[PDB]
From Swiss-Prot, chain A:
This is Small ribosomal subunit protein uS9. The lineage of its organism: Bacteria, Bacillati, Actinomycetota, Actinomycetes, Mycobacteriales. The chain holds residues 25 to 151 of 151 of the full protein. GO terms for biological process: translation. Residues 103-112 have a biased composition (Basic and acidic residues). Keywords: Acetylation, Ribonucleoprotein, Ribosomal protein. Residues 113-127 have a biased composition (Basic residues). Belongs to the universal ribosomal protein uS9 family. One of its GO terms (molecular function) is structural constituent of ribosome. GO terms for cellular component: cytoplasm; plasma membrane; small ribosomal subunit. Residues 97-127 are annotated as: Disordered.
Curated annotation (Swiss-Prot), chain B:
The keyword DNA-binding does not apply. This is Small ribosomal subunit protein uS14B. HAMAP family: Ribosomal_uS14_2_B (MF_01364_B). It comes from the Bacteria.
Swiss-Prot record, chain D:
GO terms for biological process: ribosomal small subunit assembly; translation. Keywords: Ribonucleoprotein, Ribosomal protein, RNA-binding, rRNA-binding. Protein S19 forms a complex with S13 that binds strongly to the 16S ribosomal RNA. It comes from Mycobacterium tuberculosis (strain ATCC 25618 / H37Rv). Signal peptide: none annotated. GO terms for cellular component: cytoplasm; plasma membrane; small ribosomal subunit. The keyword Ion transport does not apply. Belongs to the universal ribosomal protein uS19 family. This is Small ribosomal subunit protein uS19. GO terms for molecular function: rRNA binding; structural constituent of ribosome.
UniProtKB/Swiss-Prot annotation, chain E:
Part of the 30S ribosomal subunit. Involved in the binding of tRNA to the ribosomes. Keywords: Ribonucleoprotein, Ribosomal protein. This is Small ribosomal subunit protein uS10. The keyword Cytoplasm does not apply. It comes from Mycobacterium tuberculosis (strain ATCC 25618 / H37Rv). Belongs to the universal ribosomal protein uS10 family. NCBIfam families: PRK00596.1, rpsJ_bact. PROSITE patterns: RIBOSOMAL_S10 (PS00361). One of its GO terms (molecular function) is structural constituent of ribosome. GO terms for cellular component: cytosol; peptidoglycan-based cell wall; plasma membrane; small ribosomal subunit. InterPro entries: Ribosomal_uS10 (IPR001848), Ribosomal_uS10_CS (IPR018268), Ribosomal_uS10_dom (IPR027486), Ribosomal_uS10_dom_sf (IPR036838). The gene is rpsJ. One of its GO terms (biological process) is translation.
RNA sequence: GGGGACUCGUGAGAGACUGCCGGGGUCAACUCGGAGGAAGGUGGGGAUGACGUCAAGUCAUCAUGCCCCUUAUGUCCAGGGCUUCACACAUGCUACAAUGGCCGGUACAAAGGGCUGCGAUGCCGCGAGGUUAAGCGAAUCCUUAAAAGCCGGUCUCAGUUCGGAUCGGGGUCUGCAACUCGACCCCGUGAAGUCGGAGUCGCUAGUAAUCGCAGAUCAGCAACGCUGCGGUGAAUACGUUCC
C-alpha cells in the first residue's frame, strides 16, 4: 500500500504521498518555490528531512486546502514527520525530541460578547 | 404595546411599505425576529421553557 | 511652462502635472493625455512647445477651467440664495447643506471652537 | 420620483388643482399640504400655501425654482440664536 | 436505479437515526437494497439577545438551532414497496421527502 | 507575576544566515504582523552592509551590538519624600534585548529615505562606535555612574 | 464510468487519572523533574453567578395593587418632530504617509445567508446599475473575486501622486413618496491634520496589533455599531518596594 498520511495545523489539511525518489516538492501541481516564495517557510518544510538526513531522497506531493500560507506550511511539516515513521520505525526517538510529531493545538480564540475581540476590552472611563 | 396599535399592524395598511412586524405574544415593535415572530424577550422565556423546538442554549 | 494661466511646476510627471489646473483631476488627465498622444511618463521640463499647442486647444474645446468654472460655482451658490430655498438659507449661515449632523461636528462649515 | 425612467413626481391631487386653473387663467392661492411635490414648468406664476408643520407659507414660483421640491421653500424648524 | 431519494430532516439526534436505521429498515425485508444512511452537514442558526428587558447591553444569551439531515437513497424499485413507503409510522419531529 | 517566572519562548535559526541574532532583529522591526515585510528589511540592510565593508554582516552585526550593550541600568525607586534612581546590574539576555530595541528605535528617526538604508547606516555607525544608539550607551552609564551612592537600595 | 485508499461530513467509542519511574514531605495531602503520549498536571475556550448587598434598573416587553382621564390623557389621519446648534463630555472610524500611495500581474480562507428570494452566463453602460434568463428550497446552484501577502514598474520627503472633509454639477436603485432627513456611483473641488498638553485605557500567546468576509434587524439605509468568522502574527514578565 502507498503511504497516505495527513497533518493539520490551524485550518489547513495536507495529504502527503511520500514516494521514494530524488527530491521534488510538486505541491498541488506546483513546485516549492512557486507555492511558498518565502525562505522561512521553506526551512520548516524540509526540517524533518534534515534531522534524519534524507533531503536528497523521498520526493513528496500533497494536496493543500484551508488556512493560509503559513498554516499550510506548518501542516506540511507534520505530514512529513508522520510519513517517515511509516517507512522507517527507528527514527521515532529522533523526530520526537525536536517537536515534530506534535500537532501544536493552537486555534483562534473566539470573540466574547461585551469585548471588542477575544480579550481586548473597551475603554474604561470611571467618570 | 397599546391595544389600538396591535390591531393596526395586523390588518392591511395603505401603501404596502407602511407595514411592519410586531411580536405575536406581547406586541413589542422593536427587536422582533422573523424566524419566530417573537421579540428578544419572548424568545428568551419560550426557549427556556421548551415551548418552541430546535432551540436551546449554545456554547462553542 | 504656462498652459492656461496656471504655470505647471517643473520636474513633474505629466499625468500629475495637469492636475494643478482648476478643473482637471486625475481622471480627466488620463483623457487629456490620450487624445493628444502624449505619454503619461513624461517629465514636464522635456515638454515640447509643439506638444503644448495640442493641449491648449483640447482643453478650451472640451473642458472647463480657471475663471469660467470658478464663476459657474459661485453663481450656482448665488442662485440658491436669491430663490430662498433650504440650501440658500443654509449657505448664508455657514452650516452644512447636505443634511450633515450639526450637534457635535460640522467644524469645516463653521470655524474652530469658541468655548462659551 | 428621482429617477430618469419614471419622470418627476407631482401628486394627483395637485395637478388637477392647477390644470383646472391653467385653462381658465386665474391666479388663486393653493392651500396644499404636499411638501414633497415637484415644481414642474406649469407652476410658473402660481402661488402655493405650503404646510410647514404649524401654518401655511406663501411660496411664489417665479421662473428659476423649477427643478426643486415645493417644500424647500417652507422652513420647518425655527432658530434665531443661543443668545 | 436512483429513483427513490429520501431526505429526512429533524431537530435532534436519537430521533433521525432511529427513524432511518430501524424504521426505513422495513423495506430491505422485501428484497431491496439500500446504501445506508448518509449523514449530511448540519445547519446551525445563531441568535443572540439581551438578557435584561432594559439598559444592560453587555449581558447576552446565545441560542442555536441545529437541523440534522440524513439521506438513505434505496436503489431497487418494486411496485409493492411504493405503498410500503407510504404507511410508515414516522415520529412528529422528523420530516420526510420523496425525490 | 506573583507566581515566579514564565517560560520564555524559543527562536528558530534563520534560514539565510545561520544565527539566532538575525531572527531576533526581525521581531523588533516587525509591526502589524508584516513579518515577510520585516524580513525584507533585515535581509536587505545586511546585504547593503556588506557592500560597504566586505566583511560578513552577522560579524558586523555582533560588533554593532557589543558597543551598545549596557552593563548598568538605572531603575527607579521611591524611598522617602524624594524619589531617585538606583543602578542595578543588567543580566545578559536583557542586554541583547535592550540593545536591539535601540538600533531599530533610533533608525526610525534617522534622516534617509527607506528603512533598508536607515537600518544599514545605524549598524555601520555602531560597528565603528559613532552612531546615535552608541550615545545612549554612554548616557545610560553616565546616569549609572552618577548614582553609586544609592547602590545599597537594591529592592 | 467507477473506486473505499486519503481527506471531509457525523454517528457510536477509545484517550489523562499524578496511572507509571526517581528526589523532597508524618508512609500524609501534595510538590520539583523525567519516560511514554496528539495532549501532563484544571490540555485551551464556553455554558454555569452560593447566602446576600446597592429602597441599584425597568409601571415603556409583559403582569399588577392603589390613585387618575371618560365630548379626553381614549381614538383615526395628513404635515412636522425625535436629525436643531455659540458650546461640553464619552465611545469609534479615517488619518497625518516611503514598514507608504498609485498602476499592472498573481496566490491562500473559515463561518454563514437564499422562494415576498439567490441572479450564473451573454449583452448595454466610464461606473453605481439596466436587461435576458440557465440553475437551486440548497455538502448539488447562487452569494464567491477573500483582503493583507508575493513579483515588477512608478512617485522621492513635499501639506505631496499623503489626507478625503467640505462644496458644485450630472446619475442610479428601493419605495405611494428621498425638501426637511436615504445609501451608492461618476466628474470637478482638495479644508483641518506634519504623531497629539495635564492626565488616562486595553493586553501574558495564536494574545496584542493589523487585514478582510458573513449574519441578525432590514423595501432601502445613515452598520465606522453589535454578534460571529478565519488570514498574517509579536515584544516582554528580574520581582512585590510603591499605586
Ligand atoms: Mg482575529
Ligand atoms: Mg460604561
Ligand atoms: Mg419598515
Ligand atoms: Mg462548576
Ligand atoms: Mg430608586
Ligand atoms: Mg429611575
Ligand atoms: Mg398602566
Ligand atoms: Mg402620523
Ligand atoms: Mg435619538
Ligand atoms: Mg489619495
Ligand atoms: Mg494590486
Ligand atoms: Mg464593459
Ligand atoms: Mg496646517
Ligand atoms: Mg511628511
Ligand atoms: Mg490573565
Ligand atoms: Mg440590510
Ligand atoms: Zn414580545
Amino acid at each position: 500500500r502507498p503511504i497516505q498520511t495527513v497533518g493539520r495545523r490551524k485550518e489547513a489539511v495536507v495529504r502527503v504521498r511520500l514516494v521514494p525518489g530524488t527530491g521534488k516538492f510538486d505541491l498541488n501541481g506546483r513546485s516549492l518555490e512557486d507555492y511558498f516564495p518565502n525562505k522561512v517557510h521553506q526551512q520548516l518544510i524540509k526540517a524533518p528531512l534534515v534531522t534524519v538526513d534524507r533531503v536528497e531522497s523521498f520526493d513528496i506531493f500533497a494536496h493543500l486546502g484551508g488556512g493560509g500560507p503559513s498554516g499550510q506550511a506548518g501542516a506540511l511539516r507534520l505530514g512529513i514527520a508522520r510519513a517517515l515513521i511509516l517507512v522507517s520505525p527507528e527514527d521515532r526517538p529522533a523526530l520526537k525530541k525536536a517537536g515534530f510529531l506534535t500537532r501544536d493545538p493552537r486555534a483562534t480564540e473566539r470573540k466574547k460578547y461585551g469585548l471588542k475581540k477575544a480579550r481586548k476590552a473597551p475603554q474604561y472611563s470611571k467618570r | 404595546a397599546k391595544k389600538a396599535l396591535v390591531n393596526k399592524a395586523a390588518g392591511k395598511p395603505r401603501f404596502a411599505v407602511r407595514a411592519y412586524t410586531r411580536c405575536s405574544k406581547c406586541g413589542r415593535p422593536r427587536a422582533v425576529y422573523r424566524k419566530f415572530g417573537l421579540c428578544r424577550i419572548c424568545l428568551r422565556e419560550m426557549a427556556h421553557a421548551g415551548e418552541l423546538p430546535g432551540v436551546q442554549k449554545s456554547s462553542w | 511652462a504656462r498652459l492656461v494661466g496656471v504655470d505647471l511646476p517643473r520636474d513633474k510627471r505629466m499625468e500629475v502635472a495637469l492636475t494643478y489646473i482648476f478643473g482637471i483631476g486625475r481622471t480627466r488627465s488620463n483623457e487629456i493625455l490620450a487624445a493628444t498622444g502624449i505619454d503619461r511618463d513624461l517629465r514636464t521640463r522635456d515638454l515640447t512647445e509643439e506638444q503644448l499647442i495640442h493641449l491648449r486647444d483640447y482643453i478650451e474645446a472640451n473642458l472647463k477651467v480657471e475663471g469660467d468654472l470658478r464663476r459657474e460655482v459661485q453663481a450656482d451658490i448665488r442662485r440658491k440664495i436669491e430663490i430662498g430655498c433650504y440650501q440658500g438659507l443654509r449657505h448664508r449661515r455657514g452650516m452644512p447643506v447636505r443634511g450633515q449632523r450639526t450637534k457635535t461636528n460640522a467644524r469645516t462649515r463653521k470655524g474652530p471652537k469658541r468655548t462659551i | 420620483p428621482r429617477s430618469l425612467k419614471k419622470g418627476p413626481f407631482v401628486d394627483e391631487h395637485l395637478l388637477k388643482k392647477v390644470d383646472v386653473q391653467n385653462e381658465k387663467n386665474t391666479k388663486q392661492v393653493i392651500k396644499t399640504w404636499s411638501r414633497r411635490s415637484t415644481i414642474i414648468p406649469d407652476f410658473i406664476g402660481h402661488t402655493f400655501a405650503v404646510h410647514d408643520g404649524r401654518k401655511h407659507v406663501p411660496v411664489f414660483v417665479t421662473e428659476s425654482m423649477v427643478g426643486h421640491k415645493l417644500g424647500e421653500f417652507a422652513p420647518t424648524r425655527t432658530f434665531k440664536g443661543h443668545i | 436505479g436512483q429513483k427513490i431519494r429520501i431526505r429526512l430532516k429533524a431537530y435532534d439526534h436519537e430521533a433521525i437515526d432511529a427513524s432511518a436505521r430501524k424504521i426505513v429498515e422495513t423495506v430491505v425485508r422485501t428484497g431491496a437494497s439500500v446504501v445506508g444512511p448518509v449523514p449530511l452537514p448540519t445547519e446551525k442558526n445563531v441568535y443572540c439577545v439581551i438578557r435584561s428587558p432594559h439598559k444592560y447591553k453587555d449581558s447576552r444569551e446565545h441560542f442555536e438551532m441545529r437541523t440534522h439531515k440524513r439521506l438513505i437513497d434505496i436503489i431497487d424499485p418494486t411496485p409493492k414497496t411504493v405503498d410500503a413507503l407510504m404507511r410508515i409510522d414516522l415520529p412528529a419531529s422528523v420530516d420526510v421527502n420523496i425525490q | 507575576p506573583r507566581k515566579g517566572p514564565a517560560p520564555k519562548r524559543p527562536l528558530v535559526n534563520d534560514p539565510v544566515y545561520g544565527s539566532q541574532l538575525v531572527t531576533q532583529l526581525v521581531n523588533k522591526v516587525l509591526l502589524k504582523g508584516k513579518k515577510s515585510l520585516a524580513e525584507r528589511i533585515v535581509y536587505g540592510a545586511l546585504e547593503q552592509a556588506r557592500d560597504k565593508t566586505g566583511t560578513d554582516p552577522v560579524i558586523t552585526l555582533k560588533r554593532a551590538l557589543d558597543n551598545v550593550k549596557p552593563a548598568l541600568e538605572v531603575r527607579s525607586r521611591r524611598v522617602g519624600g524624594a524619589t531617585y534612581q538606583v543602578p542595578v546590574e543588567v543580566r545578559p539576555d536583557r542586554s541583547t534585548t535592550l540593545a536591539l530595541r535601540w538600533l531599530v528605535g533610533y533608525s526610525r528617526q534617522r534622516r534617509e529615505k527607506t528603512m533598508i538604508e536607515r537600518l544599514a547606516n545605524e549598524i555601520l555607525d555602531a560597528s565603528n562606535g559613532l552612531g546615535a544608539s552608541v550615545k545612549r550607551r554612554e548616557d545610560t552609564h553616565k546616569m549609572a555612574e552618577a548614582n553609586r551612592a544609592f547602590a545599597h537600595y537594591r529592592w
